[PDB]
Amino acid sequence: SCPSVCRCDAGFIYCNDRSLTSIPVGIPEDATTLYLQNNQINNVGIPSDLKNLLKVQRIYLYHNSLDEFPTNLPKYVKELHLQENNIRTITYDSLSKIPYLEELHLDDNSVSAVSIEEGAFRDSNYLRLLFLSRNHLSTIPGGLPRTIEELRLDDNRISTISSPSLHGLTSLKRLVLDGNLLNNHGLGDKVFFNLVNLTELSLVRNSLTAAPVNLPGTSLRKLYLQDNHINRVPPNAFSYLRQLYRLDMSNNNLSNLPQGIFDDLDNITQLILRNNPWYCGCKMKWVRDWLQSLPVKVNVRGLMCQAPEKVRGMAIKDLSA
Amino acid sequence: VFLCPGLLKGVYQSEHLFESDHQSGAWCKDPLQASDKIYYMPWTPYRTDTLTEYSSKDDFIAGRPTTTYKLPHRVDGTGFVVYDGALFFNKERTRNIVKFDLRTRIKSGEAIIANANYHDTSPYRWGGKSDIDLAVDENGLWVIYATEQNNGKIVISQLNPYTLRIEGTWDTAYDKRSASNAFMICGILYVVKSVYEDNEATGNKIDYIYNTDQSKDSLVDVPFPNSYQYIAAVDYNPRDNLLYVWNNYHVVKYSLDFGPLDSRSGP
Ligand SMILES: *[C@@H]1O[C@H](CO)[C@@H](O)[C@H](O)[C@H]1NC(C)=O
Ligand SMILES: [Ca+2]
């Protein structure tokens, strides 16, 4: 049943850190979870004997030596953990062998938008989450399948998002675009508008100079905007966004704040406006009245100027002729 | 350091705090801080990256938080502890323990737990990436994990809370996936067995104990409470001699009664 090298217990087959290339033939029929992490497993290592008699639903294959997307996997597998590898391409035939997949973890690889096959995720209308963090990516794939709820494209090299890339992904709950080359013109017109059941959008550490517009208000609870060169907030940026509970605006050079930008925000409870001083006084007279808001309780880690401190009295610090 | 209260014999639920919006997670205090602060990190698969801190139980119930600690990496499971102002936790998809200095917001260290199984490989009965459990007692810092040399069988380790280094490793002959949760008191492993959500009355008690000092281990039957049928995390405190249990959403404290501390030898 179980090999000399690999040892199993009640379905869970632990063939990890053993340091070998091929998957051992000694794979039991009543399989639950296939552990194959921290090994030397290459692309030829995976044999044909990994379907037809495999009851597996979760296969872990991180810290391995395989190139390309894995081939010959049990049809009813839901979790495909493929991390810290040199997977370049994701073809139709390779993905097609596992139709009932729920979670595809491609964190730390080399999958580019050019490297991913056109219409690979076509017959993949069962995927709940796809992680493509730190890959050779340049654009949001676009050929991405429906029923996706978690798409993490963080710490990549993605520069541009097109309108039909996220158009149709709607069912999506959380979009994580962190540490990327997304500029304001790099961020497509009315790009997120379409994503109705989106609870979380993360744009942390990018290249956008002004807080996005045409953002979903329909169901968006969180919006993470930090480590960007945001100076000007467009009036219609935080408009029709009622359902927003958390907004993060820290580590952003907001020199100004327009009169009644947060008006359309009602559910708002947590705000993070810290790490940007010298900004107070003129035009921000409304903040003094606003931050002192009606019930319920108030929570905001706001901003306050450095050179001035209290508008009361007269400055007269200018003494030159 | 801290004085040993004796051998644990009776576990009784004495305090009932609030109910979480998460079925799993961990909540604990710092036994080296004279302040009555509370640290709460609810489990959210692949999304656990923030530790919440509370000043009092009143604030902890009403959901009034003191501050939030965003962590430079994702956390795996409900293992975490808070010792001398620095939290220790299992960094996600690794066998590393990360010392993180709170109220300085800096990674002071990172300890590679040699040959440890991680990421739902050797977890508790409920899984949830609870492969490595940090532990604070009278003898200090601990790591309750498991190696595939043992193959599922729990492996405990003394861990320097200041230099983050393994100060000993003891192999136990009891499965981890069988364990619902485990903890340390006077360097003694108390391993909790409880029913979950076929789901027959397997048992609701600590059935095994391993003694670090002397390396001896025996079978027990210490009646452990599982009223909510899903034990998420159990963390002992040597300062107030209490268990800081999380159970199927229920955030609760479990009181202890201690008997005479005894150890027999014959190698
Ligand atoms: C949001 O949209 C998805 C689309 O598949 C739907 O299944 C879901 O019920 C909707 N509502 C919520 C609260 O997720
Ligand atoms: Ca514990």
Where exactly are the structural domains of chain B?
1-267
What is residue A250's three-state secondary structure?
coil
Q: How would you class B183 by CB atoms within 10 Å of its CB: exposed for 0-12, middle for 13-18, buried for 19 or more?
A: buried
Q: Does B178 reach chain A within 8 Å, measured CB to CB?
A: no
Asked if A212 and A244 touch (Cβ cutoff 8 Å), the reply is no
CA gap A93, B11 in Å, rounded: 56
Candidates A244, A291, A254; CA nearest to A274 is: A254
Which of A225, A218, A221, A223 is closest to A240 using CA atoms? A218
Residue B57 main-chain phi, psi, to 5 deg: -60, -40
Q: What residues 157-176 of chain A have any CB closer than 8 A to a CB of chain B? A: none
CA of A246 relative to ligand 1 center, distance in Å: 21
Put simply, the answer to whether A16 touches B148 (Cβ < 8 Å) is yes
Query: How close is the Cα of A37 to the center of ligand 2, in Å?
Result: 27
Going through chain A in order, the beta strands assigned E by DSSP cover 7-9, 12-14, 33-35, 58-60, 79-81, 103-105, 129-131, 150-152, 174-176, 200-202, 222-224, 246-248, 270-272
Q: What is the 3-state secondary structure (H, E, C) of B13-67?
A: EEEEEEECCCCCEEEECCCCCCCCCEEEEECCCCCCCEEEEECCHHHHHHCCCCE
Of B35, B36, B17, which Cα lies nearest the Cα of B25?
B17
Q: Rounded to the nearest whole angstrom, what is the distance from the C-alpha of residue A269 to the centroid of ligand 2?
A: 34
CATH number reported for the structural domain that contains residue A218 in this entry: 3.80.10.10
The helix, strand and coil proportions of chain A, stated in percent and rounded to the nearest 5, come to: 5, 15, 80
Domain extent, residue A239, equals 1-321
| Whether residue A171 has its Cβ less than 6 Å from ligand 1 | yes
Which helix (H) or strand (E) segment holds residue B155: the answer is strand B153-159
Q: How far is CA A13 from the centre of its chain?
A: 31
Q: Which atom of ligand 1 lies nearest, measured to the CA of A147?
A: 5
CB contact under 8 A, A16 and B152: no
Q: Which atom of ligand 1 is nearest to the CA of A146?
A: 5
Q: Please, are residues A125 and A150 in contact by the beta-carbon 8 Å criterion?
A: no
* Partner-chain contact A9 B148, CB within 8 Å: no
Out of A7, A33, A62, the one facing B93 most closely (by C-beta) is A62
**Residue A93 is inside which H or E element, if any?**
helix A92-96
Which method resolved this structure?
X-ray
What is the spatial distance between Cα B263 and Cα B261, in angstroms, rounded to a whole number? 7
Tokens 């100060």 sit at which residue? B167
Q: What's the CA angle centered on A261, arms A237 and A168, to 5 degrees?
A: 25
The number of folded domains in chain A is 1
Q: CB neighbours (10 Å) of residue B173?
A: 10
